[PDB]
Structures are given as structure tokens and as C-alpha cells.
Amino acid sequence: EFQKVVVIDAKGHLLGRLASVVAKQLLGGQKVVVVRCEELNISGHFFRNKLKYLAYHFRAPSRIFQKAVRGMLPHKTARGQAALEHLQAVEGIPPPFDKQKRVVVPAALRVLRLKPGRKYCTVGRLSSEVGWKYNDIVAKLEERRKVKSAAFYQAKLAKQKKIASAKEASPVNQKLSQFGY
Amino acid sequence: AQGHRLYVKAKHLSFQRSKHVIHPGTSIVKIEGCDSKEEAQFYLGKRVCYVYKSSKAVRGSKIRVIWGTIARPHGNSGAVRARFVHNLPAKTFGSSLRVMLYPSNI
Amino acid sequence: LGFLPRKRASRQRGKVKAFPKDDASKPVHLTAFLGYKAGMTHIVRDLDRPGSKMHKREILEAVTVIETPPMVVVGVVGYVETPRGLRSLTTVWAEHLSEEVKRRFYKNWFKSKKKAFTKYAKKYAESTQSINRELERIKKYCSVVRVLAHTQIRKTPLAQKKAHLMEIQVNGGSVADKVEWAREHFEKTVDIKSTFEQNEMIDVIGVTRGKGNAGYMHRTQLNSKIYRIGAGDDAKNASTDFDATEKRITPMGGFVRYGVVENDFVMLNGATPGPVKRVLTLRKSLLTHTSRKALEPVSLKWIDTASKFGHGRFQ
RNA sequence: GCGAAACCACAGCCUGGGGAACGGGCCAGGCAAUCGUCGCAAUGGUAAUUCAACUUAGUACGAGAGGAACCGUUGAUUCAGAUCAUUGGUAUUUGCGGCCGCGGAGCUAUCAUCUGCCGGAUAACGGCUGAACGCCUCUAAGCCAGAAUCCGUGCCAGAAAGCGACGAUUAUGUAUAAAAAUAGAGGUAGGCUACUCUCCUGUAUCGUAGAAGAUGGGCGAUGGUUGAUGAAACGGAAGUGUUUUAUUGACUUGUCCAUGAAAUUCCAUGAAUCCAUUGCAUACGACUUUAAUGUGGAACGGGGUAUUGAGAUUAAGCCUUUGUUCCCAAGAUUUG
RNA sequence: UUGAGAAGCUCAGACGAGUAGGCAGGCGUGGAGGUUUGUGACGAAGCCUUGGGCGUGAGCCUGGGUCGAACAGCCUCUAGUGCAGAUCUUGGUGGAAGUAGC
RNA sequence: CUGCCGAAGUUUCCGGAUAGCAGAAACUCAGAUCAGUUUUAUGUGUAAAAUGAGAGUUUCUAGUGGGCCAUUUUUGGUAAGCAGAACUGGCGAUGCGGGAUGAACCGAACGUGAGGUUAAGGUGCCGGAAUGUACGCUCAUCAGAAAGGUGUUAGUUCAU
Numbered sequence A: 001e002f003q004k005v006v007v008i009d010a011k012g013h014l015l016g017r018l019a020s021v022v023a024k025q026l027l028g029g030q031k032v033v034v035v036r037c038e039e040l041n042i043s044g045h046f047f048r049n050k051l052k053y054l055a056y057h058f059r060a061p062s063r064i065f066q067k068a069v070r071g072m073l074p075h076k077t078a079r080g081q082a083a084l085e086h087l088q089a090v091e092g093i094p095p096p097f098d099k100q101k102r103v104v105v106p107a108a109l110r111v112l113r114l115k116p117g118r119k120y121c122t123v124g125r126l127s128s129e130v131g132w133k134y135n136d137i138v139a140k141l142e143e144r145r146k147v148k149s150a151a152f153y154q155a156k157l158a159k160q161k162k163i164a165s166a167k168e169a170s171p172v173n174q175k176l177s178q179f180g181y
Numbered sequence B: 001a002q003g004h005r006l007y008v009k010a011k012h013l014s015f016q017r018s019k020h021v022i023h024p025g026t027s028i029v030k031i032e033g034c035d036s037k038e039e040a041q042f043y044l045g046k047r048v049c050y051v052y053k054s055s056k057a058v059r060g061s062k063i064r065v066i067w068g069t070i071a072r073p074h075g076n077s078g079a080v081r082a083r084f085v086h087n088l089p090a091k092t093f094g095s096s097l098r099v100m101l102y103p104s105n106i
Numbered sequence C: 001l002g003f004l005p006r007k008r009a010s011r012q013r014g015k016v017k018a019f020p021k022d023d024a025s026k027p028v029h030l031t032a033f034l035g036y037k038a039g040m041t042h043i044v045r046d047l048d049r050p051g052s053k054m055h056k057r058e059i060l061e062a063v064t065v066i067e068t069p070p071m072v073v074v075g076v077v078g079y080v081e082t083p084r085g086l087r088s089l090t091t092v093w094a095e096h097l098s099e100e101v102k103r104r105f106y107k108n109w110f111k112s113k114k115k116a117f118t119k120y121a122k123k124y125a126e127s128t129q130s131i132n133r134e135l136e137r138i139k140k141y142c143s144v145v146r147v148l149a150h151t152q153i154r155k156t157p158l159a160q161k162k163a164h165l166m167e168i169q170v171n172g173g174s175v176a177d178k179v180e181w182a183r184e185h186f187e188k189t190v191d192i193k194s195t196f197e198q199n200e201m202i203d204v205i206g207v208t209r210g211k212g213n214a215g216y217m218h219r220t221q222l223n224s225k226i227y228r229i230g231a232g233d234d235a236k237n238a239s240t241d242f243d244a245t246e247k248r249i250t251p252m253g254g255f256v257r258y259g260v261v262e263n264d265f266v267m268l269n270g271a272t273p274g275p276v277k278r279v280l281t282l283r284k285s286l287l288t289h290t291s292r293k294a295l296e297p298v299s300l301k302w303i304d305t306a307s308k309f310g311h312g313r314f315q
Numbered sequence D: 001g002c003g004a005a006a007c008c009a010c011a012g013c014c015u016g017g018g019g020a021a022c023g024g025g026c027c028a029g030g031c032a033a034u035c036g037u038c039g040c041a042a043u044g045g046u047a048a049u050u051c052a053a054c055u056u057a058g059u060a061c062g063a064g065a066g067g068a069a070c071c072g073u074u075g076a077u078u079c080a081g082a083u084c085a086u087u088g089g090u091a092u093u094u095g096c097g098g099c100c101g102c103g104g105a106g107c108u109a110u111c112a113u114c115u116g117c118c119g120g121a122u123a124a125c126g127g128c129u130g131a132a133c134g135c136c137u138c139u140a141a142g143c144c145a146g147a148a149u150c151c152g153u154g155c156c157a158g159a160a161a162g163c164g165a166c167g168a169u170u171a172u173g174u175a176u177a178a179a180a181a182u183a184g185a186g187g188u189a190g191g192c193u194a195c196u197c198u199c200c201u202g203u204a205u206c207g208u209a210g211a212a213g214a215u216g217g218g219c220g221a222u223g224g225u226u227g228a229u230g231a232a233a234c235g236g237a238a239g240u241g242u243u244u245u246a247u248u249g250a251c252u253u254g255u256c257c258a259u260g261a262a263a264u265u266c267c268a269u270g271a272a273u274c275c276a277u278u279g280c281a282u283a284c285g286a287c288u289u290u291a292a293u294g295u296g297g298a299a300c301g302g303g304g305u306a307u308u309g310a311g312a313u314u315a316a317g318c319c320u321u322u323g324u325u326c327c328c329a330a331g332a333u334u335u336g
Numbered sequence E: 001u002u003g004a005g006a007a008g009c010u011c012a013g014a015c016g017a018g019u020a021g022g023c024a025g026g027c028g029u030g031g032a033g034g035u036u037u038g039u040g041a042c043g044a045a046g047c048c049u050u051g052g053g054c055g056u057g058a059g060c061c062u063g064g065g066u067c068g069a070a071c072a073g074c075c076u077c078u079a080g081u082g083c084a085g086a087u088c089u090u091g092g093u094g095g096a097a098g099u100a101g102c
Numbered sequence F: 001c002u003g004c005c006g007a008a009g010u011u012u013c014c015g016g017a018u019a020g021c022a023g024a025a026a027c028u029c030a031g032a033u034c035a036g037u038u039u040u041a042u043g044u045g046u047a048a049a050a051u052g053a054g055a056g057u058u059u060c061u062a063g064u065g066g067g068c069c070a071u072u073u074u075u076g077g078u079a080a081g082c083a084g085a086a087c088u089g090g091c092g093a094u095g096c097g098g099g100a101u102g103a104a105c106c107g108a109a110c111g112u113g114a115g116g117u118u119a120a121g122g123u124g125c126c127g128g129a130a131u132g133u134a135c136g137c138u139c140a141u142c143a144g145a146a147a148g149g150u151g152u153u154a155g156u157u158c159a160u
Helices: A015-027 A046-055 A061-070 A078-085 A123-127 A135-169 B037-043 C099-105 C118-126 C129-140 C175-185
Strands: A005-009 A031-035 A041-043 A087-089 A120-122 B007-017 B022-031 B047-058 B061-074 B079-084 B095-100 C032-047 C057-067 C071-082 C085-093 C144-150 C166-169 C201-207 C218-230 C265-269 C278-284 C300-303
Touching (some): A015 A031
Parallel strands (some): A031 A087
Antiparallel strands (some): B007 B022, B047 B061, B061 B079, C071 C144, C201 C218, C201 C278
């Protein structure tokens, strides 16, 4: 299934694997928005990736994730230039996308790709000492949004419980249960 | 506006090509819900179409359609090879192609 | 390379690129002020620095005097911090607008119809609910509060009729406390005497004076301690209590390129960028230093009011 | 105003590799470009720098003498930032007094007076604790300490192709929101302690019934679906959308009927700029205030003021003007 | 069954790089004898044109616009016969350049 | 302008005459001879079965009458490399797929086209094609595509 707008949560996702699936999707004429890019993960411990950046200048993981894709797409080709603008990488979950579903990519999930006991690095933690100086405010927004979202979930859960009780109380439900519904 | 859509959405990926040589006679189409070569057998023979609009009002309408036909599968991920009456423009990469259900074999 | 490239300052009035860190525990108070440098004069002050080679001795040093008339708060600006930086959520101005501020807001004071903010003033008078809602949102959502005030250009003997209005961040207290303080101080004159006790080291920001076909570059001198912050109304502002002799701080025959200063003025040791009759910004230092020089009190002994123009001989 | 010759395959960002130059073309690369007013900072440059001594203490060490870390002071710097107050000169007040004797203003300065960074990360380096190696073990876990370095930090500039606030204003169902573990989470229930249940995805869930969804007859809900407006709260971030509804307008295939919908009789569909003013500038623009009927400004008349040595010039980048008149409630232009 | 331009028509199979070089068939220009009882003031030749065609190609036929006095297809004869270069000859014209400058 | 054939690129004696390659003609044969062929066997050569192809002459006439690379073979070497002769192919007269690009490497040698399938190489993205399956190994704090290691991985052997 593909949509005109797709929101992908970057928490617990490998950078390269996430970059690959979005690179193909972007060439497919699809708009993809990436949120919480600061919580991306890269195989290899913290010092190695720190040395990698020291050899390498954009401090935003949203820019870094965009930069990784930029060299992973035909940038010279005008088609690649057009597809670049269809990708929107932002840190955290902004209000224009907080009230929308956030899907995940199985091919990039750390739990499905990383062996237990393997060291890994977090981009937001990595970027904190390279020029980024907004971790507190970015974090502060995260708990504020999730607290509001959790309250929304509780209201939705209560509504789901009420309708579920109403659904079971409905005699119509088991009239034609032979269809598996 | 629930209803209509007697076809299946599909995306026009690219042409049949080597690493550097492209043959634009046939184009790769990725149909939704098709994810294996054995599955693409069902869509072999269907009539695919490209639908686009233009400023000129021809016959009182504003729609131009380039018909086509699915021919063979392409790889293990459900892609297909479709030949059109007019070869698709190279700009329509990553667009929508409407795979209607005829000629039906079911 | 620190100052390179050498380019003329883009702003005639010095703008502070940074402000001191605000403390919630500390009371709400201002952190910056604007003044016009009238000139520099030589004064004799006792050096009460323990351990110095000339301890308990009087030294003749240059004192820079800048007129600091009370500033009327035109309005407040609510800036909400964002991951991309500090975002100005909104700004609220007072119902009554000063003529100099309106004159400053337009490039053609005489040709203008003085219609600036006329609807906003009319809307505020008609209904204050929007202002209260805006103030409540600033006090509840905005993280940075800046108060916009205009200097007394008309009071100062300056040919320019436009006030050197600037926005100063508010440090101290909570957002609601700052909002309440701004509302209380809205459309009210704030003097530098309450802001500065003239017993601390601050920073002065100003644009240097060009020297023809090198100059006109903004600078921010630091480690500057105010020697005396006098009031123009008081006749003893320029006279110390050591020998009385009440007199005006202005030099004989008028100050060089400044004239006569009648409002509150502040005199500090050392030189500052820019020529006479130039707008300068004085703000508290972001970093606090516990040096003996910055902690020892300043007590002027003799103030020379001789004619700065020409070769004066009588104070 | 009058006016060549030379030259010319075609061009012109580099980075590397490209085997034979290859860079001037090839591949990987980067690069590659309404009027406003006040603010924000992506980004870079970058800053303070090099050494000391006294105090400390004239003492830990040391038989004593000589001389402790740290504290502040005294500084010497270098560099940058300033300014002409202080100091000297320079000096178109080239002003003065007798070509000289000098020179105010202003400029200038290791010629002058001066002002002048922050904590971390850690390097070297030494650790503590702690496995392998029941201990031990800078270390494989961890906890550290510690550099004129680095990063931060501060300063400077500002994305000319960044941003905010703010004033005036000529396609085919385009369907879907928890957080968080994942090596256990969530819910469920009891009083954080004892429970239980689900997961093992979305092929899920919601919605999808009618001449694009007709005409009416009902029945049945007498509910539901919504449209229309009347705003209430929430939503700073990018709140611009989430509900709450108030009433009204319809619709209702919720259960049903009766007609109706076609020969297309096989696919193609008003401000501001220039301008004047302006010196606060000055390769030239820019910059700079004022200026469109009033402290209006601009000019002089001056005065004051110092200069020279009382007098004259007397603000010119010395001050000021209850003095005088001039001009003008501009001249055009730009721009929705 | 008409399919004898016997230099014709028809059938089958394999094959197809190319320098130096060898062989063969053609296209085009000026003029010459024959010819088309050829074309032309109701518009020759030429010229331009994103008109239409033909040939693998050299080349050709045609529409439109200009144009105004000649021209062509076919069989042979014949030669001062085909150009992108030669720091080629002649004429024209640009950038350089409103530059050096006067 | 198109079509066909198309070398030699060097032996050998000695600027050449030969030759050779390519043609062009004339001949005689396929029941006749052959082969950068392979066997059989007699003593690596020679002679006599298979596998294929028709084979042999005479005459006369253009062009070439260099090399580079690679393989190998050796001899010495000579700091060490290497050099020196050869040996045989490929390029040279030859485009295409692959090797990031790249004249020597891996494939394959060319009329215009349609479909089909492949070689070499590839299937994360750029990039056409499985983010295939099974099994291990690799932790790098410069991976990856002589040795040392309080470096691990699997361990083996010997001691208790």
C-alpha cells in the first residue's frame, strides 16, 4: 500500500536501510515525510561514528539524513532534483504530522537487523556535541506532545471500550459469524 | 465518493534497460498487490492505460489516454513489462497507470 | 581574521547579538539600555584598589559621558523558542504611540499621514480581549520576552527627530511575571538609574566613527564599569560629596559636537566606539567576573568641567 | 566627436582517479542561481595572544641559605577593538600675530590615552573501581581526573536565491494519529505489591446498497448521516486544524415496496525610492540625518568659543542661537 | 496462369567487420549528334521555405512564395565535371570593439 | 554514392631480386587428393584408421616487405628489480556487453528490424534484476567488499 503522503517514524531505524527504501519510493513519485530523525541508529559504536564525522558540514540529522539520500539519488539528473523536494525530513513530530499515523519500515528496524550485544550510535546523541544545541527544547516538545497524545489515546481507548461493549451487546454480530467477521 | 475504480492502481517505474543502454519500447510497471512473478501471471494480458490532461480542449474534453498491454513479468517482486501504442514519455517516471481488468480470463 | 572582512556597520544603532542568561529565581528586571555619547572628559578619582602600586591614590583618567534619559516602553514582543531558533510569536504595542516612535517608524515623517498602527490602537481601545488573549498566550507559550522602548530623542539635543527605539530582552522571573511587569511598565518611562546601580562592570555596544577614505564598524567593548550615573534634574550629579561644588557635567562653552546635556547621564571610565552624539547600547555582561577592579567601588574625587572645545583653563 | 590591429575549432568551477596527456570535454563527485519597520539565526571567520615576575612565602622543600603549588598585584607583549578626553605633533579655522612665528578644530599613533573571554570533550598523562585471571588487573564493564589542543563559548558577519513578528496598503475511499519495551511491552482488574488477558501486525479497522445513486409509497428508527450558517474551547508549532456544539436545511439502502432510469442494440471516453537636505560617510554607489507648513528645516547675521599673541578668523568634523529672512502643507519616479 | 525487357520471370540455401589494395554497378555538372510530333508569358532557369513524397545512398520528383525567358527526360558522344581543409587564390563579413585609442 | 573480395604488416638470400599472403586467368580432376587434424602401429620421427573438406597445378599482378602488448621459454642476472634472446598468440584492418571510469583483462567478433534466451558480470540505492534461502566466519577505535597483540574466533595437542 502506498499513499500520496507517508509519515515514517525514524526511531529505532537504521540510517542506510531507511535511506534505501525512501530512495526507491521517492523515485516512484511518492511524497515521504520523515519524523524524529534524531532517533535514527547506525551500526557501530559511538566513537567510530564520531571519528567518521570528524573526518567529514551540516549538523542537523534531518539534513544529514537528507544528505545521505542526496548522494543516494541521481542528483545531477533533473528527475533526481525534482524527487528531492518530495522528501521532508524534520526533527521530532511537528504539529502538522503529530495527529497522523506513523508507519515503520521492517527492513530498517534495529531489532530485526542488529544482533544482540552489538553497539550502535544515535544521531541525535551524536549531533549533540558537533554543533547542534537544541536537544533540551526538542526533547521538551517530545514529552509535551506525547503527554497530550497519551491523553488522546486514553480517550480513544475509552471510546473503543464503549463501542466494543456495544458491538458485543449487538445481537447482529453473531447472527452471521460464519463469515469470520 | 466511494465507488468507481474497476481497475487496479499501478506505478510506471522505468524502461527495459541495461546499465547504460535503454530500450523504451517496453516499460516496467509495478502493480499494487503484486509481489511475485507467479502472482503477476494473473495480470498478464490486461489492458493498462496512461491518463493525463492537457490545456487543449479536444472533442470537447481534456483527457488523453495512451493504451497498452501487459506482456510478461519482470523479476520476483511482481513487476511487469507493458507495451503501449505510443511509447511513454520519459517524464512520466513515477506516475500512475490504471490496469483495467479486461481482457478478463477469469 | 577575527574582524575580517572589514565592512561598514549595517545598523546605525548598535544591536546586541546576545543577552545575559535569565534566572527564574531572580526578580524581573531589564538587562539593556540605550544612550547617546556626548563626549569624553578627564576626571580624577581615588584608586582604592588593595594590593595595587598606587593604592589609596587619585588618578586622572578618561571618563565617557553618555546621556541616558528615561525610556518609555512602547510595547512588548513575545518570542517563542523553536528547534530552528528563536521565533517571534507575536508583538503587542501600547494603545498610545509616541510621535517620535511614529516618526521613526516612517521614512517620511512630514509626508506620512501618521496612520501607522492606527487600526491596532483603535482595535485595542475597542476591544482588549485580543490583547489579553495575546498576552496570555505569550505568558503561557512564549519562552523569550523582549520589551520595545523608544529613547527620548526630543529631550536630547539631537537634530534627529526619530527615537532610537530598540527591543531589550527581559531577564528575571517567570513568563507571567515578566508579562505582568511589562503590562505594568507598558507606556511608562523607565530610567537607567533603576536598571543600573553604577557599581558594576557592563558592556557597551556602538558603531565606530569612520575616518574617511577604516571605521564605521560595530564594536562591543566589555569590562566597562560605570563611574557615576547622575540625574539631569539634580544639580549635584556632576559634583562629588568630597568637596560639593555643584556644577553641570557639560563642558564650558558646550560639549563638543553634543551641546548641553539636561537629562540623566552616565559617566564611565575608558573610551567607547563612535563619535559624539552617537547612539550606544549599554547592557549587563552575560558573564560575571569577580575581579577586584570590577568589585571595588568607584568614587570620583574631581570632575573637570573645563571647556573641551579649544584649550579650556577654568572648570 | 572620430575610431584600429593582433588574435579566434569550440569552449571555460574545480576535486580526484582515469593506465596513452588526460583536463578542455570521460566517469564518480561536489558545486552549479506592494512598501516597508523591528527582530530570529542555517552558516562560516573567529580571539584575545605570547611570556613572565612580586604577592602568595620570602616558605613546603631544605642543616640552613636559596627557594612551594595556588591567590591577587605589577607587568612586558603581540593582536584586535576603540577614542582624540590625556599626550604630542600634523593641521587649508591656512585662522591668526610679526614670507615668517605659530596654529584651533579634526585626524593620527609600540608617539598618545587606553579596553580586551568562557566551560566542557578529552589528548599526552596518571587513575579509582571492576571481569577475563572467585582476587588482582586506567579496561575487557563502568566511574574518572587532567592540555595555551579540540569542541563549545564569546565576538564578527548573515542564507544577496533564509526565517519571524509587525504597520500602512495605490483525483477515484485522493479514509485512518498513543507512547514505549522488543533481550517484554501494552491493556485488564485488585490493594507502587500481588493479577489476568491480548500480541505472533493491516488479508486490520472504519467507510463502501439506490436512474452517482432517481420518483414516490411506506414501515422502521423516530435514530443515524451530514450540508448550511451562530461562535466556544482546545491546539504556539508551523497552533489553523481538533472537537464542542446551537439551531435549521435536507438525506437516510435501517427494514421494505411500486414505478423509473436504456437501439450508444460487443472495446475505444498608499507608502517608499530617486530627489533636496545630508558628512554621522566616502574607489564610485552606498552610507547620513533632515526634508512634503513648523522647536519645519536650510541659510546667513551673529554670539559664544578657542586659536594666534587685546585684536581678526571666529565652525568649517569647536558650541549655541526667544535674531533674521528664504523655501516649502514637494518635484517627479517606483510599486497592487 | 497469361511470369519471353531469356539483359526477363522464378526457386532454394548459406552468408554480411575492414585499412593498404583489387573488382563492379550507379548518382550528378557543362556541352555534342539522335529523340520525347517534350515543357515554357495561363510563367523557363534560378532562389528561399518546419509543405508533400522517392531512393540504403549519391541524388530525385513535387506544393507554396519570389521570379521573368528559357529549359529538360531518354540512348549514345565528349571533358577545363563533383570539395571542408592545402598557414590554399579572390571577394564578402563578424567577434575582438566602440576596445587600443585620437 | 553503394556492393564484393581484402591482405601483408617478413621469411629467405641480399638497396634489390625471391618467397609468402591476397587476387585474375587458363588448365584436371571429386572413381583425387588433401588437412597449424586426431589415431593405429613400426623404429620423438616415420608409415598405414577415423574425422572432415573436392583437391591439385601453370601463367601475371597490386599492396606489404613495422611494431606494440601478452603468453611462455630460457640465460645471465643485478643491490634489487631487471636485462638479454627467443616462443606463441592477440591487438594492429575490429564495433558491441562487462571491468566505477581506463587500448590491451573477462565475454563475444557487426546488414536493417520483431520476439525469445543467454555469455562475462550483477540484483541495498544511484542501476535493469531476491534487502533470496541454508550454513558459518568478520567487529575494524584505518576493517572489509615480517611479525606482535591483557586481540578475539573456532579450536588442536600435551599436562594435571
